[PDB]
Design a binder for these strands. Structure first.
Ligand code: DGT
Ligand code: CA
Length: 596
RNA sequence: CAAAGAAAUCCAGGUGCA
DNA sequence: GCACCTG
DNA sequence: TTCTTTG
């Protein structure tokens, strides 16, 4: 039933001085060296694997190659993603049992069991504790990526921010007997920070909060102009605009923090009575006026707009922005396009000065985050025709929409994928089931929308490009799962791989084909299932070719068994885009190596 | 002083999947 | 329930 | 880098 070992540090344990009789005495040496290792702690940087080599004697491992099996697991811990696991059997399979000196008295029957127990003891009582002793795992919020930060460096960063917040009077200490609603967490955010409350899990008032949220959204639906969907707005705008489109995307700085609580309170109190009780109005006003958080053994009032991480802040920020929109961003020209997602505005017009006027208007009403502004206005510093907005890239010149992929340089793309689920575990002899979950649709489904696959404003050229890019992601997930099979399942025979990949190619082409038919428009010429299959195969080939030694036989079947010919039925499509990794995808890191 | 342990990743909405 | 996305 | 709780 229990197949997985979690890589996360939370599973660590307090080590004893010695082990009991049924554990072998060899661990006492590592325990002794472990305590001695901490007495030598230096601010100077440390390499964990080097430290373990001073802690765990070679004689524990027997052969130096048996040591490598264990340390490969540690290296995975040092480079883990959120939720990542390994198979427990990795801790005892294929070890050289004849060469482990402290097992030579145990019967051949009982050896693997004992090695699992001692390896687990080392990992849970020495390895993970020594990592946690030196480092703090920071969840970076780019996929499931984790970065390990020296504790001194993390505390120093956190103390800078906390001092700012007190100095600005955003955080004000109250008496320690005031009850807080959660714990303040300062998360690193690309050289900046995100102050959130981690809300205390209170399941008693969750139904009440859902009720209040539903009430606020009914106020919004009933009393405020409901914007068309982003897709409908772009479709109608591109259809009626004949010239060059000009446009701007802007982002509000510190959006929740700059909600003016006195204005929001007045707004809530003016909601009509049939839409919100007097008690519920008073409850919300009291709720957002008295925000109390715990931090480092003290209790603070939060006095900077709405607390990020409180469940009610979401619908209340929307209420505030809808009000701002009614006051300031309504009755705009019929010519123009506008759409707002939370604090992000996308404004376009065929008239450049109207885009300029909108920028001036938005900058008078809000404080803008100027690092996030994107525009093709010629007067601006670095104009560009591709505007990122709501996870898509809108090309103002060609009117084409492409999926936005967030892949910084030297980003390990495996951090995007959740290959292991501790609640739904898969046996080490069921590699097929592991791959089946890895190739399921939902993780990539946001690249399979009407934005990518319509032929209303998108040409076939960009429909095919969107599909190829999505299948590049799928192929990278397949590769990441394959790495997991060989290092954790220890799969020897890979016969079934050809079929899963064939079924996966066909399932994804079939999903794209249906979306293309559903969202067909005037730019549709001819899209064939066969052309989509060929594109999907070429995406896999482009990714598999990054490890041609491992995938040589697989690459060779693809080329000898599958038709890779692409009848685009559109002379504007460029075939060479489908013969190589797109540039955004060409530089992602695919080899994991510990740095700490 | 020594050791041990702790220093808390949350929320709304969306796509959907099956 | 799952696993992605937006802010 | 702090805070408890125990040698
Ligand atoms: N609880 C929570 N709220 C979030 C998260 N991401 C965004 N929000 C909410 C609160 C932010 O104020 C608002 C705008 O999102 P941003 O990502 O633009 O952050 P912010 O505007 O706070 O700061 P900025 O100056 O743009 O870096 O959306 C999140 O991960 N957790
Ligand atoms: Ca913002």
């Amino acid at each position: 039933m229990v197949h997985y070992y979690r890589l996360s540090l939370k599973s660590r344990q307090k080590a004893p001085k010695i082990v009991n009789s049924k554990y072998n005495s060899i661990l006492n040496i590592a325990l002794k060296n472990f305590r001695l290792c901490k007495k030598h702690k230096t601010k100077k940087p440390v390499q964990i694997l080097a430290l373990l080599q001073e802690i765990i004697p070679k004689s524990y491992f027997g052969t130096t190659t048996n040591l490598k099996r264990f340390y490969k697991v540690v290296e995975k811990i040092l480079t883990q993603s959120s939720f990542e696991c390994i198979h427990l059997s990795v801790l005892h399979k294929c070890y050289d049992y004849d060469a482990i000196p402290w097992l030579q008295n145990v019967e051949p029957n009982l050896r693997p069991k004992l090695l699992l127990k001692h390896n687990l003891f080392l990992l849970d009582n020495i390895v993970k504790p020594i990592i946690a002793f030196y480092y703090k795992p920071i969840k970076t919020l780019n996929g499931h990526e984790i970065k390990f930060i020296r504790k001194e460096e993390y505390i120093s960063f956190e103390s800078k921010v906390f001092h700012k917040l007190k100095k600005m009077k955003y955080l004000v200490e109250v008496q320690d007997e005031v009850k807080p609603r959660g714990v303040l967490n300062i998360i690193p955010k690309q050289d900046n920070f995100r102050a959130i409350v981690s809300i205390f899990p209170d399941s008693a008032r969750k139904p009440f909060f859902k009720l209040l949220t539903s009430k606020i959204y009914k106020v919004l639906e009933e009393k405020y102009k409901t914007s068309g969907s982003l897709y409908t707005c772009w479709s109608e705008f591109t259809q009626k605009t004949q010239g060059q489109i000009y446009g701007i995307k802007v982002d509000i700085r510190d959006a929740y923090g700059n909600v003016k609580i006195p204005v929001l309170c007045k707004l809530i109190q003016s909601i009509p009575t049939h839409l919100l009780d007097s008690e519920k109005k008073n409850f919300i006003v009291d709720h957002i006026s008295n925000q109390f958080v715990a931090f480092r053994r003290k209790i603070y009032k939060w006095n900077h707009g709405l607390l990020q991480g409180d469940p009610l802040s979401g619908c209340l920020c929307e209420l505030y922005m809808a009000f701002m929109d009614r006051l300031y961003f309504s009755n705009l020209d019929k010519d123009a396009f506008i759409h707002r997602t939370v604090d992000d505005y996308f404004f376009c017009s065929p008239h450049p000065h109207k885009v300029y006027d909108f920028e001036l208007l938005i900058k008078g009403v809000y404080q803008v985050n100027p690092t996030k502004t994107r525009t093709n206005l010629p007067t601006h510093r670095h104009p560009q025709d591709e505007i990122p907005y709501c996870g898509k890239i809108f090309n103002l010149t060609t009117r084409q929409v492409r999926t936005l992929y967030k892949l910084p340089p030297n980003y390990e793309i495996r951090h995007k994928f959740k290959l292991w689920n501790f609640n739904n575990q898969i046996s080490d002899d069921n590699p097929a089931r592991f791959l089946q979950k890895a190739m399921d649709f939902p993780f990539i489904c946001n690249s399979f929308t009407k934005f990518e696959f319509n032929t209303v404003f998108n040409d076939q050229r960009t429909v095919f490009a969107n599909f190829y890019d999505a299948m590049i992601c799928v192929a990278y997930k397949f590769d990441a799962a394959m790495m997991a099979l060989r290092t954790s399942f220890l799969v020897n025979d890979f016969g079934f791989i050809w079929l899963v990949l064939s079924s996966t190619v066909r399932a994804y082409a079939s999903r794209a084909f249906k979306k293309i038919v559903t969202y067909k428009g005037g730019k549709y010429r001819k899209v064939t299932f066969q052309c989509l299959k060929s594109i999907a195969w070429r995406a896999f080939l482009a990714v598999l070719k990054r490890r041609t030694e491992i995938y040589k036989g697989l690459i060779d079947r693809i080329k000898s068994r599958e038709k890779l010919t692409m009848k685009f039925h559109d002379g504007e499509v460029d075939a060479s885009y489908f013969c190589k990794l797109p540039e955004k995808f060409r530089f992602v890191k695919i080899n994991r190596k510990a740095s700490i």
